[PDB]
Design a protein around this ligand. Structure first.
Ligand SMILES: NC(=O)[C@H]1CCCN(C(=O)c2[nH]ncc2Br)C1
Ligand SMILES: [Zn+2]
Length: 140
């Protein structure tokens, strides 16, 4: 589990969105595993606007932050899971690291701010849903 709280937005994994998220929906994209809902309180996270390929992510199954090198956001074939069939997930970045299904929502960050959230894992891989292209998270 886990969310990004930027301005009056909550960014979660689409597959973990709550009823309250769907009832307060701003934007969702199944291809990216992303959903954004509106919040009453202002959040403290800042979004990175950069092409960093190194950063640090939170792994709930280890209670640990790990430094990683990650790929540029891409279209990646992701194996069928409890939440999606075998498909191409877009805007996904891959690194070597531990990721169990419940690690989804952990933040990946760089020197500039939040880069994305854990979206995929297994086999000693971890995939991150990028949010750096979502410039509207910074206004309105
Ligand atoms: N966005 C997706 O399609 C995800 C959904 C959860 C499962 N997915 C994984 O890769 C995964 N496997 N083991 C741990 C993890 Br995390 C695929
Ligand atoms: Zn950066």
């Amino acid at each position: 589990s886990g969310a990004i709280y930027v301005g009056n937005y909550r960014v979660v994994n689409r597959h973990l969105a709550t009823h309250n998220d769907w009832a307060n929906l701003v934007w969702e994209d199944s291809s990216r595993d992303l959903l954004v809902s509106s919040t009453t309180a202002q959040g403290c996270d800042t979004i990175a606007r950069c092409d960093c390929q190194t950063g640090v992510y939170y792994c709930s199954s280890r209670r640990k932050h790990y430094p990683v090198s990650f790929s540029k956001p891409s279209l990646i074939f992701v194996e069928a899971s409890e939440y999606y069939p075998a498909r191409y997930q877009s805007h996904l970045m891959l690194a070597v690291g531990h990721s169990e299904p419940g690690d989804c929502g952990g933040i990946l960050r760089c020197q500039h701010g939040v880069v994305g959230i854990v979206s995929t894992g297994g086999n000693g891989l971890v995939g991150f849903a990028d949010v750096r292209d979502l410039l509207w998270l910074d206004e309105e």
